[PDB]
């Protein structure tokens, strides 16, 4: 019936997610990933729920800002599409590596 051109819903989603502040990763998958990574460091560990909220707030903030730098690296290479190599350039310059 009706079909939007590629980039139209993408741009609509940018405006949408830049308007809100809610976490974008689903809470239970994230929690299970936190418990797994921590398990591989020390067994039988409990988490305050706020400690997982703090790890998720920070983690999502890190990835948002990293996607910002990644986007600039893509644009720097006259591209519109972010690629693993843009992430890697970003992290290298940031001195994360």
């Amino acid at each position: 019936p009706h079909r939007y051109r590629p980039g139209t819903v993408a741009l609509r989603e940018i405006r949408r997610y830049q308007k809100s502040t809610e976490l974008l990763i689903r809470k239970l998958p994230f929690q299970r990933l936190v418990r797994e990574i921590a398990q591989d460091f020390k067994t039988d560990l409990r988490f305050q729920s706020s400690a997982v909220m703090a790890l998720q707030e920070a983690s999502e903030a890190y990835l948002v800002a990293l996607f910002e730098d990644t986007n600039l690296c893509a644009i720097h290479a006259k591209r519109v599409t972010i690629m693993p190599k843009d992430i890697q350039l970003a992290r290298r310059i940031r001195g994360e590596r």
Binding site: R26, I37, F47, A51, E57, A58, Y62, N71, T81, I82
Partner: protein, 83 residues
């Protein structure tokens, strides 16, 4: 035993939403697994420090303060959870 198969709970549409808030229009197919590796390295570095703090307090429960202190350790200070 070895724990595995959880990182994939950070799904393709979730990474996409984060990219959107970051202003990203178009996303290569290889970005998703790459972002998983990045987030694991990040979570590893921070949780390692959090646990180090937890250990030192002789506790079995990781507190929000342990994480906050660890974020601060890495130069990633976080407001709204204590400190």
């Amino acid at each position: 035993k070895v724990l595995r198969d959880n990182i994939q709970g950070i799904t393709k549409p979730a990474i996409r939403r984060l990219a959107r808030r970051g202003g990203v229009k178009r996303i290569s197919g290889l970005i998703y697994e790459e972002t998983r590796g990045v987030l694991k390295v990040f979570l590893e570095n921070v949780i390692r420090d959090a646990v180090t703090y937890t250990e030192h307090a002789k506790r079995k429960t990781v507190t929000a303060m342990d994480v906050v202190y660890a974020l601060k350790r890495q130069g990633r200070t976080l407001y709204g959870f204590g400190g």
